[PDB]
Amino acid sequence: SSQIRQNYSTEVEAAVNRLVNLYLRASYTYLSLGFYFDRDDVALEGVCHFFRELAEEKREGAERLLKMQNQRGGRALFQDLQKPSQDEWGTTLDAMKAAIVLEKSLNQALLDLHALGSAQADPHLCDFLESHFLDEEVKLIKKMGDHLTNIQRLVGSQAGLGEYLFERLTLKH
Amino acid sequence: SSQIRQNYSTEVEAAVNRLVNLYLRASYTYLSLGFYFDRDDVALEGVCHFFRELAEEKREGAERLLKMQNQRGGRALFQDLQKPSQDEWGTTLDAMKAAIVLEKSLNQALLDLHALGSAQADPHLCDFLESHFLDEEVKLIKKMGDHLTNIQRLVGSQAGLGEYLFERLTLKH
Amino acid sequence: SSQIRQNYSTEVEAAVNRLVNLYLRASYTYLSLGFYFDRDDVALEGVCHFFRELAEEKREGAERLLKMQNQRGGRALFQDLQKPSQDEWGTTLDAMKAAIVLEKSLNQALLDLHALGSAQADPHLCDFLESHFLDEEVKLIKKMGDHLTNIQRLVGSQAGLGEYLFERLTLKH
Amino acid sequence: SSQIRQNYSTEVEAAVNRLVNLYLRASYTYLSLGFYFDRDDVALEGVCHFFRELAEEKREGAERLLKMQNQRGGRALFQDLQKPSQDEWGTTLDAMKAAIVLEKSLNQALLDLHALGSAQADPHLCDFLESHFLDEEVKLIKKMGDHLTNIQRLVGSQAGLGEYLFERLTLKH
Ligand SMILES: [Cl-]
Ligand SMILES: [Cl-]
Ligand SMILES: [Cl-]
Ligand SMILES: [Cl-]
């Protein structure tokens, strides 16, 4: 058992393990989104790249949480990882809307954990979220929102043209 | 006559010579496709470049087969090369559909030769196809499929615009 | 739907998706093993590093399979990922024994898929496993076996001493 | 008298001066621990180096607090520095246990000051501790805990052997 644990509640420990699950779930979702846009009958490489990069980012966030759990003397506990919500993700617009929904849910979990940390007077936890998660998440959601606006502007009456142009001229490929 | 030939059937030797003919035919087809897209009244440089590169690739595949024939102590035998199926190749979409048909026929010839090799217990032949042909062909067909999907998405109600944009923004020029 | 799929059975497609699940499960197991050896009350950094590296390797194997699924025109389908078999992994010896069991199960899945590929006359699948999976797996299992032998030799009557020395002098830290 | 002081309570000012004393006390303790492990009849250079480095770190923490006191317009007030708790520090294990006790006491003083800052609505103080003290302290305690676990594992029935090996193979020398 740990000889280091100090000021680290069971409630925070448990919430950290749940958050890890949420981040790995998100990572899995992005993995599926990336490979859907790699299909020969979808074939939007920039969209594929965007979501593959997010899968790695979410995995890295989970790993940081797990590292922190150990630093504080809590015990990492892994649960089953549920499969993503869809097998096929529709259009770029559909996908980007789904990603924003997912990110808003992750963001709310971060805010909830921050509030728990605050209530438990755990300033290290609060600091950790502030320093490595909250601003990263705000910046990502702004980026997604910007992308959504551009995708929406391009639907017009020529959806295929607009979806191609967005992938070619906004996304890195 | 050869002093080296070992485990190399007449059936495989003949099938290798036929495959050489198929690859040189494919090369000739791509040569014609490249020069059609170089016409002043077609003028799609990226499409021209794509098919010219494929002509060279197919020629190189034939040359590898011929080198292997000699390595095994078989005798290269050349036949007439039939001219390509069309004199004019239509749209980029028409052309890319024709290329996929051609590649699927080459792929099936590779698979047939692999099966013959397997039946004749000729592991060098089998290895050779696995190592230099089968994955190269799968990768090319995936690329073509991706291109076809993008071309199809761009037809919309503005075909000329879409054909220009594909050539400018997907193909190397 | 795909316009490229050729010689790719439904049976192989399904087996590839199952294998992806097995590799991601293995990755998750190694993630848990790595963080267990990072606990302050375990504190074997070289062991942690070893299993973290394996988590990444297994993830990369899954990604290669998914890329290949798309190259062939099959459809990636993701399933729930079961949590690892244990929450706490015992000694270095216990852990390395569990890893070998896991690797032997992955190896047998690769061999089974190879046999299916052979039966379905799918030489691209067979080649793919030969070229990127079978030898990598044999090499990993040999490494694990070597490690197990060294760990076993060091138990003696001074288990803690031996476990420290193995981590310091065999594993990269 | 200061012309700058704003939102800086007398309670925080006093608590900052007390914390400075605690950090300089800790520095003095580590100085004594370092020179004990430099004795010819102890002679554990890596252990000496470890504690000498900590003496400098604790001094640097005090200096940062003093700099911040002045930045806020408070007045540094120095008190007597009590000598360390022991003249001789026993084994490496004894020493590392004493260091963890000391660090836990410093950590609790940081948490107490953070709570006071929070209650006094002094976000600069809170930020300062979060940014330069809380995570540094968590990381140090994790390191010490890891070291303690390794030292404990090496006691076995051959304490001298284990103490030598830890110093040679874990600590920088
Ligand atoms: Cl379960
Ligand atoms: Cl003739
Ligand atoms: Cl389900
Ligand atoms: Cl005095």
Short mmCIF file of C-alpha atoms in Angstrom, two decimals, chain B residues 47-132:
data_model
loop_
_atom_site.label_atom_id
_atom_site.label_comp_id
_atom_site.label_asym_id
_atom_site.label_seq_id
_atom_site.Cartn_x
_atom_site.Cartn_y
_atom_site.Cartn_z
CA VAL B 47 -4.04 13.33 -64.78
CA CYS B 48 -1.47 13.01 -67.58
CA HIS B 49 1.33 12.73 -64.95
CA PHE B 50 -0.57 10.11 -62.95
CA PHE B 51 -0.98 7.79 -65.94
CA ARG B 52 2.55 8.39 -67.30
CA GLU B 53 3.94 7.31 -63.91
CA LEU B 54 1.79 4.19 -64.07
CA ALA B 55 3.09 3.38 -67.55
CA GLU B 56 6.63 3.37 -66.17
CA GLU B 57 5.57 1.28 -63.12
CA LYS B 58 3.96 -1.38 -65.29
CA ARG B 59 7.03 -1.51 -67.56
CA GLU B 60 9.20 -1.98 -64.46
CA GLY B 61 6.97 -4.84 -63.30
CA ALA B 62 7.39 -6.60 -66.66
CA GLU B 63 11.17 -6.14 -66.42
CA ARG B 64 11.24 -7.68 -62.94
CA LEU B 65 9.30 -10.68 -64.20
CA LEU B 66 11.73 -11.07 -67.14
CA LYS B 67 14.71 -10.83 -64.80
CA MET B 68 13.17 -13.53 -62.58
CA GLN B 69 12.43 -15.79 -65.62
CA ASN B 70 16.15 -15.70 -66.43
CA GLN B 71 17.15 -16.19 -62.79
CA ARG B 72 15.14 -19.42 -62.74
CA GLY B 73 16.45 -20.64 -66.13
CA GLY B 74 13.20 -20.22 -68.04
CA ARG B 75 13.11 -18.61 -71.48
CA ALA B 76 11.50 -15.25 -72.09
CA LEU B 77 9.18 -15.35 -75.11
CA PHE B 78 7.59 -12.14 -76.36
CA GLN B 79 4.29 -11.89 -78.14
CA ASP B 80 2.56 -9.13 -80.04
CA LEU B 81 1.33 -6.32 -77.81
CA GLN B 82 -2.26 -5.38 -78.43
CA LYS B 83 -3.13 -1.70 -78.63
CA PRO B 84 -5.19 -0.17 -75.85
CA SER B 85 -8.91 -0.64 -75.76
CA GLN B 86 -9.83 3.01 -76.55
CA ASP B 87 -8.34 5.83 -78.65
CA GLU B 88 -10.09 8.51 -76.53
CA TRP B 89 -10.69 8.00 -72.83
CA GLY B 90 -13.55 10.35 -71.94
CA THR B 91 -13.56 12.13 -68.60
CA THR B 92 -11.19 11.74 -65.65
CA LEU B 93 -13.91 9.61 -64.07
CA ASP B 94 -14.15 7.37 -67.19
CA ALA B 95 -10.39 7.00 -67.21
CA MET B 96 -10.07 6.15 -63.55
CA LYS B 97 -12.86 3.55 -63.87
CA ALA B 98 -11.03 2.00 -66.82
CA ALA B 99 -7.75 1.94 -64.86
CA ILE B 100 -9.42 0.12 -61.93
CA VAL B 101 -10.87 -2.49 -64.30
CA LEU B 102 -7.39 -2.97 -65.80
CA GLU B 103 -5.76 -3.24 -62.37
CA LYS B 104 -8.35 -5.75 -61.17
CA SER B 105 -7.55 -7.88 -64.23
CA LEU B 106 -3.80 -7.68 -63.51
CA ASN B 107 -4.45 -8.51 -59.84
CA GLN B 108 -6.46 -11.57 -60.76
CA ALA B 109 -3.63 -12.72 -63.08
CA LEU B 110 -1.17 -12.34 -60.16
CA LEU B 111 -3.50 -14.37 -57.90
CA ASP B 112 -3.93 -17.03 -60.54
CA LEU B 113 -0.15 -17.32 -61.01
CA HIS B 114 0.30 -17.48 -57.22
CA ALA B 115 -2.23 -20.34 -57.05
CA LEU B 116 -0.39 -22.19 -59.87
CA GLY B 117 2.89 -21.70 -58.03
CA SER B 118 1.30 -23.06 -54.85
CA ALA B 119 -0.08 -26.10 -56.70
CA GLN B 120 3.32 -26.78 -58.31
CA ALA B 121 5.11 -26.40 -54.94
CA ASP B 122 7.21 -23.52 -56.27
CA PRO B 123 7.81 -21.37 -53.17
CA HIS B 124 10.34 -19.09 -54.88
CA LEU B 125 7.67 -18.01 -57.42
CA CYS B 126 5.10 -17.56 -54.66
CA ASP B 127 7.55 -15.51 -52.56
CA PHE B 128 8.50 -13.40 -55.55
CA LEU B 129 4.90 -12.39 -56.22
CA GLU B 130 4.23 -11.75 -52.52
CA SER B 131 7.36 -9.61 -52.12
CA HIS B 132 7.20 -7.47 -55.30
#
